[PDB]
Amino acid sequence: GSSGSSGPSMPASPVLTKAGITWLSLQWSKPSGTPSDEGISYILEMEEETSGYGFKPKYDGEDLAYTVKNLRRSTKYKFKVIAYNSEGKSNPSEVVEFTTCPDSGPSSG
């Protein structure tokens, strides 16, 4: 905290274009009236494993969309878009929730 270099304002929560079984296609946009530097980056976070420890980074690129991978069938997960700059990062966005499709798989074996 404390005075320092400000980053990108609060971005819009990540949407869910298509919800797969072992993948999740989220969609986020840039904040209003950007500070500077064309094309912003956003880190997709997710919390659903640790015992109230903290969110972990999943994606780290300069795209306003990503295809999550390594998931579980018929499962719920949290996700929050985090906009950051090569200089630093800002506060996370609203925590959204999504579900996946069924699978069943073989199970037995």
Side-chain angles (χ1 to χ4, degrees):
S2 249
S3 56
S5 177
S6 216
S9 331
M10 196 189 159
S13 346
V15 317
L16 164 87
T17 67
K18 236 201 245 260
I21 299 152
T22 76
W23 55 263
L24 284 169
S25 257
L26 313 179
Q27 238 247 245
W28 59 84
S29 32
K30 91 217 299 189
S32 271
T34 38
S36 75
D37 230 34
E38 70 168 59
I40 292 185
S41 45
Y42 313 71
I43 311 148
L44 192 65
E45 270 207 310
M46 177 244 226
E47 220 246 306
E48 212 79 319
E49 50 204 57
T50 65
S51 216
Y53 245 103
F55 269 80
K56 83 80 137 280
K58 260 141 119 77
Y59 166 81
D60 36 42
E62 39 180 89
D63 325 333
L64 310 176
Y66 174 71
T67 282
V68 192
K69 285 155 203 202
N70 210 18
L71 310 172
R72 272 200 221 161
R73 65 272 214 86
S74 252
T75 307
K76 75 252 247 75
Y77 286 132
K78 246 180 278 254
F79 292 110
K80 78 179 88 180
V81 88
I82 281 148
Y84 99 90
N85 221 316
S86 252
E87 279 242 65
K89 75 131 135 74
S90 246
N91 309 69
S93 194
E94 264 235 305
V95 176
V96 299
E97 215 189 304
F98 292 126
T99 282
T100 38
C101 251
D103 181 354
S104 93
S107 306
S108 76

